[PDB]
Symmetry: C2
Subunit: 69 residues, 2 copies
């Protein structure tokens, strides 16, 4: 427990997002014609179990960022 | 197709929320000044020089839990 430990945990997590080549490839393999359709399709499957927890929403926000930027 | 990605993202989000160590350290921020905590953690996260989007999203995950507790 400390501010150092928290920063390293977040640093580790963020670095896991960007360096996960499998995720990056799946994200690139989706589409680039019409992001709106891709977003709602991915969102529907992510939440088909009904669980709308904050971690998943942030994952979806990361995905949308890569789609529009 | 879209399924493997959605499953991948769902797993990442559930892992964030089940990171008990992470949830526990974040819950310990009973500070008079959230701003200082925010800048302190953000400074350590970027002390190398790499301002990559993944770290920013994790900082955004942290900041949301930090600020939306009041």
């Amino acid at each position: 427990a400390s501010t150092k430990k928290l920063s390293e945990s977040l640093k580790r997590i963020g670095d896991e997002l960007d360096s996960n080549m499998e995720l990056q490839r799946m994200i690139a393999a989706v589409d680039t014609d019409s992001p709106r359709e891709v977003f709602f399709r991915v969102a529907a499957d992510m939440f088909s179990d009904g669980n709308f927890n904050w971690g998943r929403v942030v994952a979806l926000f990361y995905f949308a960022s890569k789609l529009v930027l």
